[PDB]
Amino acid sequence: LGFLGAAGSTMGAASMTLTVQARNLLSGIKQLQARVLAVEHYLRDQQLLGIWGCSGKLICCTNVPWNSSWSNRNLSEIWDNMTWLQWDKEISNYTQIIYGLLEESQNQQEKNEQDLLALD
Amino acid sequence: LGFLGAAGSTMGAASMTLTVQARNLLSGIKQLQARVLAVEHYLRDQQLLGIWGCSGKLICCTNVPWNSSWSNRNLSEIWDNMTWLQWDKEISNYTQIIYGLLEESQNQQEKNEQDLLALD
Amino acid sequence: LGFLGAAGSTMGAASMTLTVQARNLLSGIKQLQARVLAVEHYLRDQQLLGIWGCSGKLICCTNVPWNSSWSNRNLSEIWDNMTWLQWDKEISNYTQIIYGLLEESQNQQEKNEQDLLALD
Amino acid sequence: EVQLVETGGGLVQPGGSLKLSCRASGYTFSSFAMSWVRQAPGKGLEWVSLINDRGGLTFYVDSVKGRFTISRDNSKNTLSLQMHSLRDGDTAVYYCATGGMSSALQSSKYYFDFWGQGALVTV
Amino acid sequence: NLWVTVYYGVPVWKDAETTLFCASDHNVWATHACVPTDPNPQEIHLENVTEEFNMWKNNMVEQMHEDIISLWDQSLKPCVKLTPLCVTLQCTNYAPKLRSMMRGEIKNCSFNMTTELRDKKQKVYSLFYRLDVVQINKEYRLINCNTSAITQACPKVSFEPIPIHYCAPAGFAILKCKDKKFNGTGPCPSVSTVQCTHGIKPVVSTQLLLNGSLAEEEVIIRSENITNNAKNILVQLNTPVQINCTRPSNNTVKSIRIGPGQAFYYFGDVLGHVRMAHCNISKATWNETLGKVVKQLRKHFGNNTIIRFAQSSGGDLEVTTHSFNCGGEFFYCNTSGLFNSTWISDSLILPCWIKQIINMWQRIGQAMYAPPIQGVIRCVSNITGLILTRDTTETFRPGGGDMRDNWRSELYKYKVVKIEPLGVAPTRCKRR
Amino acid sequence: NPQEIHLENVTEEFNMWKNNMVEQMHEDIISLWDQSLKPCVKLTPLCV
Amino acid sequence: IRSENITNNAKNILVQLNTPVQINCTRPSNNTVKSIRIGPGQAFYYFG
């Protein structure tokens, strides 16, 4: 395929091209500003992903359950019958909620890990 | 609370607001230079932390013992009865020593892991 | 020693100074552009390591076997009798092949981990 | 002055269930880990379960590992133990106790400081 | 038994010097080039945090000074260069039969001026204020010819002091002091953190400060060193004193072309009467205001020490008279009627005058020509503070000239710190 | 090698009248034009 | 003696010495400098 080649395909197939997309995200004043901004944008996503407990991973998962109010649309018949562009609109009003939960159920894990390692 | 809201609280209590602080560290020439510098600073801290074996963690512990000479003022004395701004002065002359030890007792770990993985 | 002090030493000996080299990679338009580029270069290497499944590590091994066509030179012949500068020429035509393999034999791992975590 | 007061208990036939609870005061409840200790009529003391101060980490003795749940509520200042699939060997006085593990920032104890009087469980 | 634990995101900081960016919601200040504004400038009170402030070492002040000078120069750079006007002028008195205060203040001069074509000259008559010309031995020259070329300020660019907010770059924070009766240095216990400062109006004046903030409770007297006569004393008032300034002359503005797309604007004539510019100050308010200032000065100098105010001592107009920009005209006013007392334990009028050749910020070598303002001028502002200097009595006189002090009076509440979110402490765990 | 990838099964909304690429081209063309006239002879002496 | 191509006579030869040769240069004449304002803020300096 190539960059964005899977954009019109289902979430299932598209999940296998994450490497392709990731490699194309990262590389007179106005041109220099654009480059600096691209770096800041990139780093903010990496910081966020790291905060959530997901660092050097393209795919990772956590302990935050999916709420049925967040566009409950089956699983198998939707995951493989929907594109990412469509999914992105289906849950666009919930990403801030999800992101907040992802951070909370990480800070809890760091504290639990720190305590377990303190047991002699 | 909010950014720096825990600055006047104890070290223990303030350890629970690390996420808040982390998210506010990262987002015509003079201003563009300031942005570039902020990025370089950010990356230097991330590199350093990664060298010590601490990657995406906000809290991580290691194998370097605390020396009693490094202001070892008891334990509850600092976590419950001191703020981070005070702690930063109590050990300000030992951070380079500690950082050197943290780097060393990592490189040793990487070699041990590399050898163990070589056993059949 | 110091930065690049191990450049003339064998690969085995030089593998112990990786920390030194890594720390020297990070810190009017022409000069500002040079700084922005240094950051973009750094980040590309970090992205690549993350893609390969090797994040906060200076040394990491993977599941890609060494192909003897990629300049086989024994084992001790390389590590105890060659410098990194020489090795760099011995396999200069194979780095893209190797990198492609390193990315593929990661995506295979991420999917296998995702499926194992789905078992109850 | 520590006030650890157990309730619940009673006679439950084998295979049944019950819930014990302990209310507490005097000491900041949320600052301490708590455990349940069993006093069988002839054994004296058996450790059963431990919960950390935030209510997120629990540990059990093998004999109740697949049957009992230890839980905490820091707004209620309540410690509780839910027993299931009770057996004759579980007849004992069950004590509410303060102690055991700590927070990793605060002088780990590994001993019990305070005890309640104990609820009686007969299977 | 304890091990080193590393924490990232630790709420600590160090004093630091950085570049702040501005934001605001044409004007001389490039407000359109400074607009990354924030409708919700959240402020976080920091409980139990005491920080040391020092307004005399505050680099936010130095940056504000540099930014203002730079914006001024950029905005008024692409304008008409009045180099063709550095000619010999033939002048007489505008109103030779006038027996008023304005007798001799306005000159009626002629020029041999350039025009659109290089082959021709035109005879031009215009009016000048006395302070803009020099007799050279009839036979006058513009005063700027002695040192520099002069540029006509663009008529389309306003001198209104639109508020500017200063915002921190990521990794930095601005801390407010917020104690009451904060004298510029030391440990405020009421500190709060903000992303960006309140808007500060870049009002430029000498002697008296206009349109600034007020003290919350009582007059606050600040100094780098209260006993060093080489230093200025900045006085912040807790009440405004209203001042009403005017230019009671209906002027007509004329213009000519002096080159290929270049035009010169000038003072043509006066309709109605010729009257002296002036400012009105409530007499009672001013006397009460000084009484408050003296009461506070006695805290440093003694309640048995006689304190007197006196007339400014000398130098050029920017240091001997009050000056401000109202309606675009540049006024100079005599404050000798205010600083005249001796304190021991209806309205006041300041005569004023205006001039069109202005040397801003001691930048000798770069003059500006202020085009005349059509019609009449009325301008109302309050005095929010004043600048004093010092000679069994103490003598206080008005100060000025160095604009950094005008900005110190607004930025005294802020400091910039660098966030350093990484540190270690002993804990009880070993990694594995 | 100006590679192009067909986005099979992608439909997208275009609006040429709100396309800011036009505004950038407009400004860059004017700027280049103007820059190129800076190091040149002024003819103000000819306005006679 | 250094050269890009020592056999190419069109190239320069750069010769680095291992010892300095001292050279003393002078303008043995006491000159007086005068100045004239030639415009509003400009002055010309010249050999008087």
Ligand SMILES: *[C@@H]1O[C@H](CO)[C@@H](O[C@@H]2O[C@H](CO)[C@@H](O[C@@H]3O[C@H](CO)[C@@H](O)[C@H](O[C@H]4O[C@H](CO)[C@@H](O)[C@H](O)[C@@H]4O)[C@@H]3O)[C@H](O)[C@H]2NC(C)=O)[C@H](O)[C@H]1NC(C)=O
């Ligand atoms: C201290 O703060 C006060 C309060 O803001 C400030 O006084 C204000 O000054 C402005 C400008 O000098 C006054 O606004 C004028 O009001 C008249 C009313 O008819 C208008 O005609 C004026 O507009 C003309 O000029 C504009 C310039 O671009 C043109 O665009 C326009 O078409 C007109 O030509 C202008 O709006 C305002 O009324 C006063 N406020 C008071 C209470 O008088 C004062 O100047 C500040 N002090 C200092 C020293 O700056």
Ligand SMILES: *[C@@H]1O[C@H](CO)[C@@H](O[C@@H]2O[C@H](CO)[C@@H](O)[C@H](O)[C@H]2NC(C)=O)[C@H](O)[C@H]1NC(C)=O
């Ligand atoms: C799923 O999300 C819904 C809201 O979208 C959560 O329900 C809300 O919970 C709060 C908690 O007090 C109530 O006040 C709201 O009235 C609830 N709203 C609705 C529509 O029920 C729900 O609890 C979430 N479920 C899970 C499992 O987290």
Ligand SMILES: *[C@@H]1O[C@H](CO)[C@@H](O[C@@H]2O[C@H](CO)[C@@H](O)[C@H](O)[C@H]2NC(C)=O)[C@H](O)[C@H]1NC(C)=O
């Ligand atoms: C704790 O720190 C002290 C110094 O702060 C270390 O002791 C020093 O060790 C060097 C080793 O050559 C001696 O030369 C110094 O004289 C020692 N100083 C003192 C005061 O004795 C000590 O070894 C450190 N402890 C640990 C466990 O690292």
Ligand SMILES: *[C@@H]1O[C@H](CO)[C@@H](O[C@@H]2O[C@H](CO)[C@@H](O)[C@H](O)[C@H]2NC(C)=O)[C@H](O)[C@H]1NC(C)=O
């Ligand atoms: C090692 O690399 C060589 C090539 O450098 C691989 O051999 C090739 O494999 C392809 C597979 O279709 C054949 O078409 C080529 O003809 C092979 N080349 C040669 C020279 O035989 C080899 O398979 C690789 N080894 C491993 C273990 O993967």
Ligand SMILES: *[C@@H]1O[C@H](CO)[C@@H](O[C@@H]2O[C@H](CO)[C@@H](O)[C@H](O)[C@H]2NC(C)=O)[C@H](O)[C@H]1NC(C)=O
């Ligand atoms: C500008 O012109 C003035 C007027 O001739 C020069 O300054 C005068 O110098 C005499 C010397 O005693 C003083 O008495 C006058 O009072 C001065 N006049 C003023 C207005 O200051 C002045 O030096 C000239 N400036 C330059 C750069 O030559």
Ligand SMILES: *[C@@H]1O[C@H](CO)[C@@H](O[C@@H]2O[C@H](CO)[C@@H](O)[C@H](O)[C@H]2NC(C)=O)[C@H](O)[C@H]1NC(C)=O
């Ligand atoms: C604040 O001002 C006072 C003046 O009132 C300074 O004190 C003088 O310092 C000089 C330094 O050589 C001494 O010679 C004087 O005798 C001092 N005066 C008195 C009355 O003692 C004081 O040092 C200034 N503060 C600072 C920090 O410089």
Ligand SMILES: *[C@@H]1O[C@H](CO)[C@@H](O[C@@H]2O[C@H](CO)[C@@H](O)[C@H](O)[C@H]2NC(C)=O)[C@H](O)[C@H]1NC(C)=O
């Ligand atoms: C300042 O106060 C004076 C009065 O002392 C005002 O002067 C009067 O202004 C009115 C306006 O038309 C005239 O009719 C009076 O004849 C003036 N009186 C005198 C004595 O001249 C003056 O206008 C005030 N100025 C301001 C700015 O308010």
Ligand SMILES: *[C@@H]1O[C@H](CO)[C@@H](O[C@@H]2O[C@H](CO)[C@@H](O)[C@H](O)[C@H]2NC(C)=O)[C@H](O)[C@H]1NC(C)=O
């Ligand atoms: C400046 O002085 C000139 C010279 O007297 C004034 O111009 C004269 O005005 C009278 C009034 O009718 C005319 O008759 C003359 O012909 C004018 N002279 C010239 C040479 O044009 C001029 O008006 C004065 N300027 C102002 C603003 O009053």
Ligand SMILES: *[C@@H]1O[C@H](CO)[C@@H](O[C@@H]2O[C@H](CO)[C@@H](O)[C@H](O)[C@H]2NC(C)=O)[C@H](O)[C@H]1NC(C)=O
């Ligand atoms: C150094 O300069 C010499 C002199 O020009 C070059 O040699 C000439 O190379 C051309 C190439 O066709 C021959 O035709 C000439 O006959 C050569 N001249 C001589 C004297 O042999 C020589 O190649 C240059 N060296 C390099 C590296 O370019």
Ligand SMILES: *[C@@H]1O[C@H](CO)[C@@H](O[C@@H]2O[C@H](CO)[C@@H](O)[C@H](O)[C@H]2NC(C)=O)[C@H](O)[C@H]1NC(C)=O
């Ligand atoms: C350049 O030539 C002029 C003209 O001869 C010299 O100026 C004359 O010097 C004599 C000496 O006393 C004067 O009497 C003349 O009046 C001067 N002429 C003028 C026009 O002023 C001039 O000095 C020569 N320049 C130098 C540097 O010697």
Ligand SMILES: *[C@@H]1O[C@H](CO)[C@@H](O)[C@H](O)[C@H]1NC(C)=O
């Ligand atoms: C486009 O839709 C058709 C429908 O069957 C599908 O077969 C094809 O693979 C889709 N294209 C992409 C890029 O997924």
Ligand SMILES: *[C@@H]1O[C@H](CO)[C@@H](O)[C@H](O)[C@H]1NC(C)=O
């Ligand atoms: C929901 O998932 C089940 C799984 O078999 C599927 O059979 C069902 O049709 C799905 N419902 C939909 C898509 O409405």
Ligand SMILES: *[C@@H]1O[C@H](CO)[C@@H](O)[C@H](O)[C@H]1NC(C)=O
């Ligand atoms: C989902 O199934 C419907 C059934 O006709 C099909 O039209 C649609 O294109 C499918 N969606 C995707 C993303 O392939």
Ligand SMILES: *[C@@H]1O[C@H](CO)[C@@H](O)[C@H](O)[C@H]1NC(C)=O
């Ligand atoms: C988000 O909220 C808007 C409010 O009108 C609504 O129309 C839209 O459908 C919502 N999106 C989702 C994913 O529910």
Ligand SMILES: *[C@@H]1O[C@H](CO)[C@@H](O)[C@H](O)[C@H]1NC(C)=O
């Ligand atoms: C400030 O100190 C008091 C002293 O008891 C404490 O209660 C309060 O919580 C402290 N403030 C913060 C932010 O912790």
Ligand SMILES: *[C@@H]1O[C@H](CO)[C@@H](O)[C@H](O)[C@H]1NC(C)=O
């Ligand atoms: C160390 O902390 C404990 C906590 O109770 C305290 O009792 C002890 O006295 C402290 N150590 C010293 C030397 O004071």
